[PDB]
Amino acid sequence: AFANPRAALRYLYSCYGYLPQSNMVQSCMDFTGDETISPFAESYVKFAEGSYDSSNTIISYWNTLFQGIRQCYLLKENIHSVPKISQEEVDLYTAEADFLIAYFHLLLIKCYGPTILVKELPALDTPAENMLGRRPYDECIDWVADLLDDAATRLPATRNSSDYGRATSVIAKSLKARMLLYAASPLFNGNPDYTDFKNPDGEQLMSTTYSEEKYKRAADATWDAIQAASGAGHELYIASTTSNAYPEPTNLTERTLRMTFMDSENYKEVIFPETRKAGAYGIQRKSIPFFPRGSWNGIAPTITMLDRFYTVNGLPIDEDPEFNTNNKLDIVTIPEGTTYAEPGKRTLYMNMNREPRFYAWVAFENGYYECRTDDKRYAYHKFWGAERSEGDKWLTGFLATENCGVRADDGKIVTAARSQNYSKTGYLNKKGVHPGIQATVGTPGPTVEYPWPVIRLAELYLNYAEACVGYGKEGYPEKGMAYLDKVRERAGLKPVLESWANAKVPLTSYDGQCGPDGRVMKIVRQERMIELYQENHNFWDIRRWKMGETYFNVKARGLNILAETMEDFAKIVEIQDKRTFDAPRQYLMPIPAGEVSKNPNMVQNPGY
Template sequence: MKKLITYLTVIVIFSTVFSCEDYLEIVPDERPTEEDAFRNPNAALGYLYSCYSYIPKQRSGTSSIDLMTADEIVTAFEHETFAKFPRGEYTASSPVISYWDDLYKGIRQCYIFINNVDAVADLDNSTKTLYKAEANFLIGYYHFLLLRMYGPVVIADQQFDINMSVADYPLRSTYDASIDFIVEKLDEASQDLPLQPVSQSDYGRATSVIAKSVKARMLLYAASPLFNGGGQDMASLYGNFLDDEGNQLISTTYNKEKWKRAADACKEAIDIAGAAGIELYENSTYNSDLPSDPIEKDLRYVFVDKNSSEIIWGETRKETIYDFQFKSTPTVSGFAWNGVGPTLTILESFYTKNGLPISKDPEYNYGNRYNIVDTDLGATMGLNLEREPRFNAWISYHNSYYEVIRGAEKQVLTQYRRNDNYGIQGRSNNYTPTGYLNKKGVAPELVQNQYSVSVNYPWPVIRLGELYLNYAEALIEYGQDFSTAKDYIDKVRTRAGIPTIDEAWNPIGGANDQSTLRDIVRQERTIELYLENHRFWDLRRWQIADQYLNDNLQGMNIQGETDEEFFRVTEVQFPRSFSQRNFLMPIPQSEINKNELLIQNPGY
């Protein structure tokens, strides 16, 4: 590591509230010394906010490692940094997007804060205790982000001397030891964190619900096949992943009890979230005419509504016109970039209106799904019809409406053939590579014809729907209490406007065994958490990423000028590559060069 982590020039951050929005925005305010940073309560609070500034900006496609880099979508922005990940173009010497150095800087800054805050005059003890709990939460959270990317981490359990010799640098701990350290940090922090934000201006700061939810997600990952001996059915990938003393850095032995530990943590997080008043976003009273269907409206606003009852932790930094919403929306006179195209993989993952996979529903015309069908809005493909509300709420297809503001218009009819209004035409950029556009995470009242984002909202780092699915998955994999697992999946399904598992599956043989329920909960995650930074990690932790990320993706023939030409399944000509080493990210070679005892991840 960089002199265990290079000395950080103190950048103090303060909170602001923009456009009367009730969430935290972080902007820099330079202060030259640590002494200045702790000279009074306001300066100390600013320093604490700066500790939050190392949280990755998840909604930014350019710099986010996990937003648009799985198989959910293909974009027209292959020239941007993130696109090197689906192409497999990252190495230890050129890691492209690496959080290693920044996160360790953030951890060090948190320890500096903890070690200095007691000296702040005129700051009462209860506030000091709260601030330390927030810093401890961030130490745990940053270690988790490192663990998720790199596997076993170098545990930073104190503020190390920046002048320490290389021989004294700590080395990578085992994966299980890393987990235990993070659990301890999160549990310690949660004892002194508030259940809910103290005031609206504190939105985005740590709470006990957030700490317990991070812990639950991490333990779910730890129980998953990649980190748990390959699971029940696969071999571990890490038989030769040893440190210099021969310790196995990731266990190669499957331990079923890790699923029980994860299930218990998920239930604890769900219970404390309930005590905090967090609930699924349903029966929306949001002041909007569209979507007109009430279930689709709930789904469209589930986190776009900045007052959503479901958000456990929202990341509050402002969006720009080059971020998620403008990338997704249909172009108009040089505004918006028309380039986030859902793939055939995700399109076929959504259920039918009966809540079954399209290949299993006897009422769905699966064999003819690619046929052209006439509708009131014009010709479209059978695949786009008779689908569940989440498909209609989150996917824009040929001859359907996209809810967005253009002057007096509140929706636009989207057509994607070559010469249509949102087709590729002659452009080399700002087109959908698949003949579809994403609508999820785009506010229906977003004003398009201006160079600013008219609707900002907190990006969902964690929401209750995820916790329910986390809990269900852990119960299913533990092999007990399938009934409760189905109950929690059904909470998500019911909100989505589809029948419960038993209602949907009983007519075709039922869903009562572990293998079937595993398929169901994984498909539910694929649908419900679509484009929320999850699938990049899910495919890896399930140890199946090589089955999905190693082939070019498919959509419609966007060069087709007629319906017959356009509605033809076509491979998108952007290469995709995944190898076994890509299950983990590489530690930057520059860090290995500084400390040759630091073990690199396999394959790099």
């Protein structure tokens, strides 16, 4: 177990193994909140349904992460003792074990708010059984930030290939920054919902007064993280213009956005990779055009999510005078020369003239899906005539009688609409789907695997912008907004002030429009909702912004997927899958009921 240095290393990897595997779609808690909907009945869906309380926790970080923390303290206890172990190995594995303790607690704070602080190896199985009590939120934040800072001084700035996925100082700084931004957010920073949220002895657990200083702290920490990341070689991904084995997508901006974290020739944007394999049941085979049993045509962007993408002018659809929201469902003819949809076919108005990120990441009526097949069956069948680019991209039709629609089968239409492996909305996801994926009748792993981006540099840029705008003073907004404009520029857009010059209500300066409730913050938040689409942020961002009732207590919407004509397709229907959110209770997850029973000083989260 600690019998030799190799055994010790396998043990450090077991500690890492207790981290939630965020790219394991069937088992993660936070795949999405409201961005996509699917017919696969994964565990995360139970959170979307609102079906969690102290007796039905679904996924209990409280249990699993505490066990991970214990293992880290064991490694720390026993590492000096391993035969033949070097001081180099002792220092590094200890640093990584300390990092993990911090990160496990960061995850607890994210999920539960106030947490126990495990400061030493715990002897009993659960926090309450060790008679640990929850500490004020700000105390927990400050403790974890200190441990991350200290671990950072003892970690390398990058990992070698064999160690990829393991901790670095850049990761530690980036996690600290993110956590501090969360602490400054409406849910945690002077939130009136929590005035009486106290331990049984009366100790107040949540800050009661809003502090602008919390945003400044987050902004300074995000600046530290950005400087560390750029010092270590990280940059925003831009696609190569040279030929490679994967020619689609061909539009260079769409390709840049599609391949941000999936192009192994340039992973420099990725700061924290999740290198455990997502496997067959991950995002790729669940998103691609129908061909069972390896191609499931299921992860479908919702209307709410589609409405978040910008127009081609980098503006919200309800702020761009050149986009008529009254006409979203109008049927239009795709003109000659259109590169993201088939000339001469028809589609809905709201699918045209959107920003590159829309075409990079959304499949829609008579747009294209860059993917492959090992057999021209089902959606890839010659019958449909959807093959393009010598088999590297495919025309997607979502009417019931078209290749990606509910009555389609192997080169033929069938009477019944299927109830499995279909798009509930009339759209499909393309983000995180490598264009080299091969549809197939089997159920192997995806053709090309890649690490999932737990942290990537564009998130740091948006975190900085958010914190700078939230603070709103001392010249911070201008500094942070410049980094948000770099994200926009990479996505083919103009800077904010250039784009909002022509908005329905123009914005010509940040002055007097900052702070967490102003126009500039609204711009930041929507940019984040787009840029980080389907990367496990929505679930937590909607919560920290206190927008849980607005978005998570509303059923998803889609187009009329039973339609056999474009005219009947162009109608928005409510999807009846349960979607509920009880505010403020469900902003935080429930402490397991038994924990509050075992330790009198343990308090449940409000409302549970």
